[PDB]
Amino acid sequence: MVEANLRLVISIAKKYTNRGLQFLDLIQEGNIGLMKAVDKFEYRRGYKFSTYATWWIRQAITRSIADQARTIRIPVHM
DNA sequence: CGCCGCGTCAGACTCGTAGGATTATAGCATACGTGAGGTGGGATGTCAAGGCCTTTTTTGCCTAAAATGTGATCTAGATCACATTTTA
Question: Where is this region: Sigma-70 factor domain-2?
Fold first, then answer.
């Protein structure tokens, strides 16, 4: 599953590899959200998988950029 | 053996001049801890009157005793117009 959907991970990743942090870190975090979605996904919902891990990936990257990527940590609320 | 290609590595010295950055990234719910706020409470620190001792300020006082007064009786100084008289 994971080795299959790596291209989803990288595709979504490089929408956000504008000069925020760096490519490969967005990619790696994307693989983390991917592994979550593989751990959680239900076939019985019968939907496509792409959407599910799209959400999960996007969460993971979207707050790893914010936790990291600065010398001064601004937490999520600000 | 002797190229050839690729790569590594230095490029003078002291002063001055200016301020200075930027893109876009979801959203709400749970639940937990830490910062700025209260809060009585030991405990410390202050400020105004009183009891131990010595010193200081009044102040007794203690007797040597030298000093302070009594006043009629004197005394040895002190004067002034005339008559010379001396000395530089």
Answer: 1-71
